[PDB]
Amino acid sequence: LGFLGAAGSTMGAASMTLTVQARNLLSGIVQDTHWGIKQLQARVLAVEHYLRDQQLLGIWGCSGKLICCTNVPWNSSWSNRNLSEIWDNMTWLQWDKEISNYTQIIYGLLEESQNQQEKNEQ
Amino acid sequence: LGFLGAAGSTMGAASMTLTVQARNLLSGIVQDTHWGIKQLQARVLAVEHYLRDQQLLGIWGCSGKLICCTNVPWNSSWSNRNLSEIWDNMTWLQWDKEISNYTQIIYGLLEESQNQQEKNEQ
Amino acid sequence: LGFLGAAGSTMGAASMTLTVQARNLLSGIVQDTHWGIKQLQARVLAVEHYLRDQQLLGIWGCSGKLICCTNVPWNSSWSNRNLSEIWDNMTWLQWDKEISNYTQIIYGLLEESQNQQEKNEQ
Amino acid sequence: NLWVTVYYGVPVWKDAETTLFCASDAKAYETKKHNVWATHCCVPTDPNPQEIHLENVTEEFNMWKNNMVEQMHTDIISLWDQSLKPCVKLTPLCVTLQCTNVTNNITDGELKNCSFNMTTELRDKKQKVYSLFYRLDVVQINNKEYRLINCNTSAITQACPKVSFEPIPIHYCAPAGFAILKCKDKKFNGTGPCTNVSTVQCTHGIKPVVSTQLLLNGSLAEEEVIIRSENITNNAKNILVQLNESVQINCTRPNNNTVKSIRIGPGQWFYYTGDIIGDIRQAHCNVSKATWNETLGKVVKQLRKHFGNNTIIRFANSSGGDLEVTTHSFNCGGEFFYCNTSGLFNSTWISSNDSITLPCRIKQIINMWQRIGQAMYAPPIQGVIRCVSNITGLILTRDGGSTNSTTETFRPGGGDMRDNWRSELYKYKVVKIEPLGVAPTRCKRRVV
Amino acid sequence: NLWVTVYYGVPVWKDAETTLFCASDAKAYETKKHNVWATHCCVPTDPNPQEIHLENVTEEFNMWKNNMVEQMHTDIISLWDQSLKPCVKLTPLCVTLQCTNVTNNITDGELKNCSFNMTTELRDKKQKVYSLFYRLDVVQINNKEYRLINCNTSAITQACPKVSFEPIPIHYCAPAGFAILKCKDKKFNGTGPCTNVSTVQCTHGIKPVVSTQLLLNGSLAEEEVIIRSENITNNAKNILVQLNESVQINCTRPNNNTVKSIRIGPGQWFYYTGDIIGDIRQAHCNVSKATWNETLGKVVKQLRKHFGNNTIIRFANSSGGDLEVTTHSFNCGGEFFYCNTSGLFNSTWISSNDSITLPCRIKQIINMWQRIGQAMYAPPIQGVIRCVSNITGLILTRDGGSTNSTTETFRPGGGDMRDNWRSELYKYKVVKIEPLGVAPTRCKRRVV
Amino acid sequence: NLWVTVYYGVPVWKDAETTLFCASDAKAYETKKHNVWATHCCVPTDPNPQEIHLENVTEEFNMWKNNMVEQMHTDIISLWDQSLKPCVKLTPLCVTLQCTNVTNNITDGELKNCSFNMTTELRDKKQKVYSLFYRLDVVQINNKEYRLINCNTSAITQACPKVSFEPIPIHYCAPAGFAILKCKDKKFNGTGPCTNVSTVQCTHGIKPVVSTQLLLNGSLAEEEVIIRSENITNNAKNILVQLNESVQINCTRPNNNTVKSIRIGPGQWFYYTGDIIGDIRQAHCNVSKATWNETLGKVVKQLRKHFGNNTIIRFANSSGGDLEVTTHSFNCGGEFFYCNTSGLFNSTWISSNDSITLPCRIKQIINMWQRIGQAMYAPPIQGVIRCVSNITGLILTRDGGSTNSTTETFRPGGGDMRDNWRSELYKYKVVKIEPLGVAPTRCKRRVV
Ligand SMILES: *[C@@H]1O[C@H](CO)[C@@H](O[C@@H]2O[C@H](CO)[C@@H](O[C@@H]3O[C@H](CO[C@H]4O[C@H](CO)[C@@H](O)[C@H](O)[C@@H]4O)[C@@H](O)[C@H](O[C@H]4O[C@H](CO)[C@@H](O)[C@H](O)[C@@H]4O)[C@@H]3O)[C@H](O)[C@H]2NC(C)=O)[C@H](O)[C@H]1NC(C)=O
Ligand SMILES: *[C@@H]1O[C@H](CO)[C@@H](O[C@@H]2O[C@H](CO)[C@@H](O[C@@H]3O[C@H](CO[C@H]4O[C@H](CO)[C@@H](O)[C@H](O)[C@@H]4O)[C@@H](O)[C@H](O[C@H]4O[C@H](CO)[C@@H](O)[C@H](O)[C@@H]4O)[C@@H]3O)[C@H](O)[C@H]2NC(C)=O)[C@H](O)[C@H]1NC(C)=O
Ligand SMILES: *[C@@H]1O[C@H](CO)[C@@H](O[C@@H]2O[C@H](CO)[C@@H](O[C@@H]3O[C@H](CO[C@H]4O[C@H](CO)[C@@H](O)[C@H](O)[C@@H]4O)[C@@H](O)[C@H](O[C@H]4O[C@H](CO)[C@@H](O)[C@H](O)[C@@H]4O)[C@@H]3O)[C@H](O)[C@H]2NC(C)=O)[C@H](O)[C@H]1NC(C)=O
Ligand SMILES: *[C@@H]1O[C@H](CO)[C@@H](O[C@@H]2O[C@H](CO)[C@@H](O)[C@H](O)[C@H]2NC(C)=O)[C@H](O)[C@H]1NC(C)=O
Ligand SMILES: *[C@@H]1O[C@H](CO)[C@@H](O[C@@H]2O[C@H](CO)[C@@H](O)[C@H](O)[C@H]2NC(C)=O)[C@H](O)[C@H]1NC(C)=O
Ligand SMILES: *[C@@H]1O[C@H](CO)[C@@H](O[C@@H]2O[C@H](CO)[C@@H](O)[C@H](O)[C@H]2NC(C)=O)[C@H](O)[C@H]1NC(C)=O
Ligand SMILES: *[C@@H]1O[C@H](CO)[C@@H](O)[C@H](O)[C@H]1NC(C)=O
Ligand SMILES: *[C@@H]1O[C@H](CO)[C@@H](O)[C@H](O)[C@H]1NC(C)=O
Ligand SMILES: *[C@@H]1O[C@H](CO)[C@@H](O)[C@H](O)[C@H]1NC(C)=O
Ligand SMILES: *[C@@H]1O[C@H](CO)[C@@H](O)[C@H](O)[C@H]1NC(C)=O
Ligand SMILES: *[C@@H]1O[C@H](CO)[C@@H](O)[C@H](O)[C@H]1NC(C)=O
């Protein structure tokens, strides 16, 4: 559908194009006088954002996947919405707003669960 | 054989040194007045190239490997050369020229195949 | 315990917080006139160090793990200390000094072992 | 029975501020036109700028808090100053002048004939220079004694005569990791939700025209005249009026000049006005009367939708202040015009062209963007200048102080250049892509 | 039976050199105070700078090889020079002067009344300027002929009068990937192991005070006076003495000045001393006598721990050299004082305040950091200046050449500004984090 | 039955353009030699620059499209201009001069004895300066009136006398991700395939010698004289001739000068020629005759391989133009020589040294790289200058316009400095490494 073509799609359907957005994060690959310093800063910043997100996927055990399941249970306090509405009626934009106060909670739980798994694997 | 020591070797033998080249992509780790801005730009660019290639390996499911097999079949339209010539007589330099108009085709197929696999794994 | 809180802890206990330090390597994400060029250089350098270490974990087959075992045996010439002292009495700071002349040896062995494993997996 | 599933490459975004790339679209050759808008902004545009419609996406916009306005403002000022950096300084002109009135067929003491001792390429030699100045650039000290107006305040430099400042369309493009959202709602008033949104990597081209009071050569509104403001009822805010039609303005500087030049130092070429061929005429601008009359009648019809259809709307001229604020200032052929727009605003609305002519003044010493600091000297242009511009909009302000008589007064006020960029940039918003997120699934990780 | 296990995120580090961030802690507004220490260093501090104690960690420090000293030195000089870059040049002052002595109730030929032909905003006009100068800034050429002292060596520029150089605390912060280790040992002498170490991302704030011989407004030692040096027995090295108490010094420039200004070019404002209201008094500094006497007695008690308790310690004044070295130089209210510290060091120790007053000289032409090059002109300050500073330490040197008589001589020597930063930075070390490493485990990789 | 297998770390590459690092090889100390080629290019070289032979690798080279030439050109010009940036400006010299002829034992009106009113460190004082100039730097205005030649065109600055421009070998090194391919084919003519290729991270050191017509102090060809050109039959292209032997040239400036200096401003030191001790002699260069004769005979033998062995080859002098083009220009001891090379090209070939002396002219005002803009003033050098250079090659051009008489004419033309760098850089090419690629294998991914 093209970049962000799925933005208005529901979450289930939207997942069909995850590679579309992933490939547009490092598109900067195609793209003294302060004009030069500003452009260079933009390039460095894009790299830093890419790596920060990639590191988290690494930490959580999902470094090689667009979609991955974990061992952390879902809290009804985050969302008690019907699973079918979440995937078939709701969009990702709406969803992000709906659970926006929990991102840091979920991420902390993911970090702990993965570390425990690795401890046990050894 | 040292960096690019295998450049004239046939493809099979050349694969024995893949770590040699991989380690020379981030060698920049050892390496206002515009002299400074030019050097800084070179460093940023090397990082961007590294990441663009690493991202593709990620997308295709080969992020952790120097060599990986996929589920995409080989087309005779790309090359109908005997498999034994490809690995025992041909070099990688020759090979890249031989199939140079297909790199973007193969990459698109790899992206689709991996995304389908992950969809099914869930 | 917080960043480097475990620095004086023994090696076993210290491993319990590996995610604490990992997350502080890309913290630069939160952080013309030469003041600007100096800050930009610092940011680029932090990225380069991150990637150099991440690449090695990649090369050795441990890209997705904080802790990973390999197929390379331990040499008594590196350390003949009791395994129990290493994990229960010794700290990582002491340990790094204790085996400091072997880091490049161990890394070379890891590179070879992983490459051999991949050769055989194909 | 549900577990967290992590998804990467999720098509969502957040409001953000960043730095945009400047692209030229190859309308000028840097080396043939020597256009400041072509150099620096040397990034090519996308020959196939495919736009992506976002189906079922509702987003909110706010043109008054749009960071792209500040970005354009900062970059234009910087470009301008960099462009003048290597040019010849005219500080040797801060000498006394002996001046008289022009000895020609002149009807309006607009021109001063001055002489002075100017430097030469050698330190031991001086030369007599004779030139004409517009009175606005020259002030008295006490065959009368005059000095240039800038000499008690700041350095003056000459614009390089070889450099063009003629605006070309400029496209702004997002850096990787960012995207630009464009609102297509025909009635969008600058704020609130828009349900017709598409994503582009680049904005359309906007010409960086400097025009103070009247918005020239911009885009047109579709269907209706659109009146936008930060606050309808705040008389301290400007009202930006975008027309859905255009008004042609013919501006001329009729005096045929002979331009002369001398060296005033080692390769330091200085240009001056020389003299005038033929008689003397006043600079002026022509607007068809019927067109102007309809233009404001349409504006009134729309203003009444905010103030009441039983109201009275009158237009009046500038309230006062410096010429840079009270007159219509624009660049026509490299020349700087200050036109008397009072001829356009002498009318009240209640429940064969016969063009209106606005007299104009000319200045050579220009203080850009209301800064106190270095002045630019605009060299004279050989011959006669004529151009035709499109009024695409107006900036209006209300006096306020109303007693609810309904007789509200509007004036061609404002003058802050940021508003003349806001008037085009209002269609675009920039956001950051946030590809990582989570959702519940009926899936658990294989247990290890 | 053991195999290599690779661990990532290991809490270890190595000595390293890097670039630190400068944070202001919001003590001044950049736009209201126009403080050079607030601008540029605009990074905010952490409102909750949580410190992490490192339990059971022993580390070694060396203040004499501490790269943070060089970093502070380089950054201060650069900031200073950048701050003066846009200011008015005073090269038109290198003209001859006609000077006489001040016609006032003066007891000490300290002030010269000079006149000269100064430039104006027009090249055709000169103006007579009358001003007073301190004799240290003016030298003879052959109603007598004088010139400014800097004119045969370098350009002189005026400090912008609107810019403050008053130091504010500055915090240094590590870039990501680095950490700062702080030593809390109360007896730390600058070198060797410290067993009380914590990690911070930022240092505490240090005020970049320039003070040569006496260390002003710094931190205090706890419990005891601490004497630190690179080498106790090397008479070529400085001894930094940190007091555990403070001495207040009251410095005044009593002459009430009328400050005047003229344009000497196009917006080029120049400030000068005008004249003096009232009588003439010598600049001076007051220290309580008992306090000073105890202060040195404590220093002696501690010096004896290195030289012997059966020794004799005498203090003497500066051995010789330029005022920038031999006097106590500091910035008080924008003014530059050069005080005669010999009044503080005329004493020997062996086995109702009655304040000591140090006469001071004033200079307007300042050569910062012992560089040969451009001089800064300090504009005069309207009115009368008074300030009170805290002596927090001393720089002492020994003469050496000892015959072991035990009568060792100490002087207020040194003068190298790096030492006045070292005196605060000694508590901190910066290291690089090295997260990757290996150890044996009784674990083998699953065989594939 | 075959599937795609992806391989990473594949040893292949593509043609690319990038930025190279400049390394000094520690031949000079930045702080002792003050050599512009040592500063900036402070990166050390590899003490063990291991080269890797590429077995069975054939690659194509093209010296005429080699981006390294442009890189060297841009960097040299920039270095030069940065090096002169902080030096004293000599714009106060654009004054009239009173000049006569030198009163000495001179045979050839080469030297002008001029006097002028120069500035001093004070604005109120002028000083009389007497100096000698070479006639090429001084032109008439109308005991005769003269001015410096640059004063009607551009600013002139003095090279800092403390700065050396003596070339040292410079090594260029690839940035990570790139590699340099070196061609070892002894007969390589600048274009097409080379079967003896090795990879290096750095080029060997090349001295950035500026020498116009004759290539000095470069590398030698092995086995045979090699003649390279973009197009053999294009008379608009230069022919670069690389000798396999060397010719020594002894160049001298015999006049023993006394160098004097004055302050012309606040630390603004100016150097001038003073006077001449002893008699006056013409600058000149000596080449052994037999050596030169053999050198061209070898060149002819090789030129005939392209034009026919039945042809006639004649050499002639420069066709005309400015001295910077028509004479042999080089830097010898800081001095700038313009030698008359016609003495080297007065010969035709058909089917006890007796050295040839070339008279030379000296210039102090130098326009580098055929730019119109600022000129560099070369200060005089105290004493007498002598140096010996190695001719390692020639630049020849053909007149063309041939009627196939076979009597072809070659001249010491060209003069474009890029060619004098191309002549060494021809051995190297830079490529980008492309580590990622695919190939078929009889392997399928485990199915999941
Ligand atoms: C709103 O938009 C309109 C146009 O849509 C602008 O009006 C144009 O303004 C430009 C600049 O003032 C005018 O261009 C000038 O034309 C002069 C005459 O050119 C004639 O011959 C050429 C030959 O092909 C024809 O194409 C052209 O139509 C004319 O017939 C030129 O001499 C001028 O050149 C100057 O600049 C160049 C730049 O490098 C120098 O090299 C030259 O020496 C010289 O200095 C210039 O080209 C243009 O004609 C105007 N258009 C119209 C229709 O009149 C409005 O100004 C704009 N409004 C605002 C407020 O900007
Ligand atoms: C060691 O530390 C002490 C302080 O702990 C320093 O002494 C201070 O020095 C500063 C600068 O010399 C003094 O501040 C000056 O005070 C003048 C008078 O202010 C009075 O009114 C204000 C009103 O709120 C009171 O707060 C204040 O206490 C006084 O009552 C001001 O006029 C000065 O302003 C100047 O700078 C500003 C900067 O933008 C300009 O805008 C002004 O026009 C003007 O130029 C200035 O504020 C301060 O009072 C001193 N403190 C004391 C207690 O005296 C020592 O100098 C320091 N030691 C060293 C070596 O640095
Ligand atoms: C091709 O290559 C040759 C060399 O292979 C170049 O010729 C050399 O040119 C340099 C510079 O012109 C000459 O060096 C100069 O020598 C003067 C005399 O030195 C004598 O004493 C020293 C003591 O150890 C001996 O080593 C030396 O051989 C002599 O015996 C010096 O006085 C000069 O110094 C100047 O520069 C320094 C730089 O900081 C200043 O500090 C000094 O004050 C002064 O200004 C300088 O060292 C060198 O001798 C020449 N070699 C030969 C053999 O003559 C050719 O020039 C080069 N061709 C081209 C075209 O560049
Ligand atoms: C501006 O003043 C100059 C100076 O007087 C006028 O030029 C003079 O015109 C007379 C007319 O015959 C000549 O004889 C003089 O030689 C001219 N002077 C010079 C310096 O050329 C000039 O005409 C005046 N211009 C206007 C428009 O009044
Ligand atoms: C410095 O010298 C000036 C110049 O002579 C003195 O100013 C003069 O003071 C007398 C006193 O009546 C006046 O009549 C003059 O008009 C003043 N001159 C000017 C230029 O104003 C000045 O007083 C001297 N200052 C000192 C401190 O000696
Ligand atoms: C260049 O001109 C100067 C100026 O006349 C000559 O210097 C003079 O030489 C005579 C000879 O006795 C002296 O008496 C004068 O005092 C000298 N003048 C100065 C200013 O010193 C100089 O000799 C001439 N040089 C040449 C080479 O002709
Ligand atoms: C020009 O004429 C006007 C008429 O009022 C007069 O005021 C002015 O001073 C004259 N100026 C000169 C320079 O002659
Ligand atoms: C000022 O008085 C002193 C007294 O000795 C004298 O030496 C000095 O030259 C006088 N200076 C002037 C400028 O009158
Ligand atoms: C200005 O210069 C004149 C010389 O014509 C001199 O007499 C006068 O004293 C100077 N003025 C001052 C104030 O020095
Ligand atoms: C020097 O002598 C030559 C001889 O022809 C003459 O032409 C020239 O004008 C003289 N120059 C001076 C400055 O005397
Ligand atoms: C300096 O200027 C004077 C004019 O007053 C002139 O006579 C003299 O010759 C000039 N001096 C020199 C050395 O040219």
Author numbering:
A (entry chain D), B (entry chain F), C (entry chain B): 520 to 550, 568 to 658
D (entry chain C), E (entry chain A), F (entry chain E): 33 to 140, 152 to 185, 188 to 309, 312 to 323, 323A, 324 to 397, 410 to 506
What does the paper say about this structure?
Protein constructs based on soluble ectodomains of HIV glycoprotein (Env) trimers are the basis of many current HIV vaccine platforms. We found three nanoparticle candidates that can stably incorporate model Env trimers on their surfaces while maintaining structure and antigenicity.
We selected a BG505-SOSIP trimer as the HIV Env model for initial optimization steps. A further modification involved knocking in glycosylation sites at positions N241 and N289 to occlude the immunodominant glycan hole that is present in the BG505 trimer but generally rare in other HIV strains. The data were therefore computationally segmented to reconstruct the nanoparticle core and the displayed trimer as two independent but flexibly linked entities (sub-particles). The nanoparticle-displayed BG505-SOSIP trimers were reconstructed using a localized reconstruction approach. The signal corresponding to the nanoparticle core was subtracted from the particle images and the trimer sub-particles were extracted and aligned independently. The final BG505-SOSIP trimer subset from the T33_dn10 nanoparticle dataset consisted of 84,435 sub-particles and was reconstructed to 4.14 Å resolution. A model of the displayed BG505-SOSIP was refined using a combination of Rosetta-relaxed and manual refinement in Coot.
